[PDB]
């Protein structure tokens, strides 16, 4: 029943709320050293001890896990690595949730490349850990959809709701015991990482839909899709695609329209430098754009 969970961020918070809804007790909450309701406040309301060490790779934390003897180990969107030297101490294993569809479509930075194509079918996988990192067998996988009008905040809300109703089904599966896994292809395994900020620069040679996903990926409060003309910075927050002259000139100012590799792009909102966000026509007025 009682186990020591390692969690972090709102994914971890929601996991704690999920297992609490089923009556699960947490011996200790090993999180990293840190507006939403803090899990620390909730755990203090329940009166249960908390520890947040910088690292568990000492004999001392080894003996904590030894005599606490947890019964099942989870991983909600953890940032710091848990390498096999700690995975050995787990009696029943470790189950990590990750937001991509295994085993297909792996590579570099899956999150943005599922946004590039705007796929209506994505998924989130709860999977095991083995001697080979992130190569354990699939335990469960769930499917989700992407709407054409989704902004970052609302689709994050969707993924939280998805985690909710998914864990609602995974909790009975684990309490009943071990669940049969589904094998993967070893010839299609990798190790994922992150991206660079320099991807925010708007290469206007890219297609209109591609630029749409680029604008989508940097929605508020991400740094934003920034570009410079002369010595002037700006960032675009939202835009649409609409169906002459040589590509590269600005067709109209009110509304401001930009020619691209295919079709035209109409900018809804942008911020110029450090100034507040405003619609395209005033931006073109200050920037001196021409029709």
């Amino acid at each position: 029943m009682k186990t020591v969970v390692f969690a972090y961020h709102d994914m971890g918070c929601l996991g704690i709320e999920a297992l609490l809804a089923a009556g699960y007790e947490i011996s200790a909450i090993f999180t990293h050293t840190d507006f939403y309701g803090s899990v620390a406040r909730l755990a203090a309301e329940r009166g249960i001890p908390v520890y947040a060490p910088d690292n568990v790779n000492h004999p001392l934390w080894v003996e904590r896990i030894a005599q606490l003897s947890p019964d099942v180990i989870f991983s909600f969107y953890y940032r710091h690595l848990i390498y096999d030297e700690i995975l050995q101490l787990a009696p029943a294993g470790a189950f990590n949730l990750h937001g991509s569809l295994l085993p297909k479509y792996r590579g570099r930075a899956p999150l943005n490349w599922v946004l590039v194509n705007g796929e209506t079918e994505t998924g989130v996988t709860l999977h095991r850990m083995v001697k080979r990192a992130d190569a354990g067998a699939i335990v469960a996988q769930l499917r989700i959809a992407i709407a054409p009008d989704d902004i970052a905040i609302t689709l994050h809300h969707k993924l939280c709701h998805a985690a909710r109703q998914l864990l609602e089904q995974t909790l009975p599966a684990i309490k009943h015991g071990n669940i049969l896994e589904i094998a993967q292809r070893e010839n299609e395994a990798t190790c994922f990482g992150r991206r660079t900020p320099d991807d925010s620069f708007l290469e206007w040679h890219k297609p209109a839909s591609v630029l749409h996903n680029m604008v989508r990926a940097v929605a508020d409060p991400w740094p934003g899709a920034f570009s410079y003309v002369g010595n002037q910075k700006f960032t675009v927050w939202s835009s649409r695609v609409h169906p002459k002259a040589q590509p590269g000139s600005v067709i109209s100012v009110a509304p401001l329209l930009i020619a691209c590799g295919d079709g035209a792009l109409e900018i809804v909102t942008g911020q110029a430098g450090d100034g507040i966000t405003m619609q395209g026509s005033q931006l073109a007025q200050t920037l001196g754009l021409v029709q």
């Binding site: 010595n231 040589q246 000139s249 001196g288 021409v290 029709q291």
Partner: protein, 330 residues
């Protein structure tokens, strides 16, 4: 004798060097961090380049001040973004080091030829711009870019003080909106060209519609490098000693033109020039300080100088240059 022109790598520096190498009793040692623009004159026997930077190097500049016989301060930072992000940088470089060289020049009885700025008039309401008899109007204090600019004016005032009690040999000269071949690079933050003509070259190269500010009625005066630089030469020998304590402007008030005739002349030369076929065309005109006429009495009073070279023909040579010298491998 020995000539040090601090800030050799530039438009005015290069043309000053070219003019100086026309006379036989000058040695040219140019000090600057870069040498790309004057690489044509390295092979000349009496040219000698030295790497330097007034912000960091101290012993090199002082040693040259000791060894040389005429000293010409010429470089200035004109980066717009630096004005906004870090005014402290431009304040800590552009002010105190220069005051240091002025003080060393006093201590070593040296000539100082300081390039004062012509933008001090601002928005004078009088129809005839004067320098010491008309009133002056300045903009609001809330804008940050004048923060540096105004101190430059105060800087001039300091050398003026050196006039009275100790009588330092000084000369403040003001160039007004110059032009000539060997144009500055697009992204280079170096002075030497009007913004109107530069934006016009951009409007041609990128083929953007020319924005007629109130019909393009704002009148400006333009000068040629050759006439002004020969005038500078005759101030350098300081004939008659009479230029002591004198403030000298350079300009061609008669050659005063609004933007509109500049556009007409630009179109006249552009529709005729043959190599146009690698460039985009013009997209038409879109309809959308106003008058400056400085006095040139002191130039006649002290040196009897009258300008020769006109305005339109110099545009033709400059534009033809910046059209023909664009690297075909681009």
């Amino acid at each position: 004798m020995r000539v040090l022109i601090l800030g050799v790598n530039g438009f005015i520096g290069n043309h000053l060097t070219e003019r100086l190498l026309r006379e036989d009793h000058y040695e040219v040692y140019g000090l600057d961090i870069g040498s790309d623009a004057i690489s044509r004159f390295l092979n000349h026997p009496h040219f000698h380049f030295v790497e330097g930077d007034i912000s960091i190097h101290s012993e090199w500049i002082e040693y040259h001040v000791k060894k040389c016989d005429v000293v010409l301060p010429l470089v200035a930072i004109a980066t717009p973004i630096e004005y906004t992000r870090n005014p402290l940088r431009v304040f800590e470089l552009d002010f105190e080091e220069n005051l240091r060289i002025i003080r060393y020049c006093v201590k070593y009885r040296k000539r100082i030829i300081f390039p004062s700025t012509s933008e001090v008039y601002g928005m004078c309401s009088d129809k005839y711009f004067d320098e010491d008899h008309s009133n002056l109007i300045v903009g609001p204090v809330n804008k940050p870019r004048w923060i540096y600019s105004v101190s430059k004016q105060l800087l001039d005032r300091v050398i003026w003080a050196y006039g009275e009690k100790e009588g330092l040999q000084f000369t403040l000269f003001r160039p007004f909106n110059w032009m000539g071949p060997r144009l500055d690079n697009l992204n280079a933050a170096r002075i030497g060209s009007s913004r109107a003509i530069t934006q016009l070259i951009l409007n041609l190269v990128e083929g953007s519609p020319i924005k007629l500010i109130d019909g393009g009625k704002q009148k400006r005066c333009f000068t040629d490098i050759r006439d002004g630089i020969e005038a500078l030469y005759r101030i350098i020998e300081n004939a008659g000693n009479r230029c002591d304590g004198e403030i000298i402007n350079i300009g061609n008030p008669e050659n005063e033109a609004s933007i509109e005739e500049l556009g007409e002349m630009l179109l006249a030369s552009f529709e005729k020039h043959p190599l146009r076929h690698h460039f985009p065309p013009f997209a038409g005109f879109r309809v959308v300080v106003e008058h400056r006429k400085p006095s040139i009495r002191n130039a006649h009073r002290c040196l009897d100088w009258e300008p020769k070279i006109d305005m339109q023909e110099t545009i033709d040579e400059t534009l033809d240059f910046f059209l023909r010298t664009v690297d075909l491998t681009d």
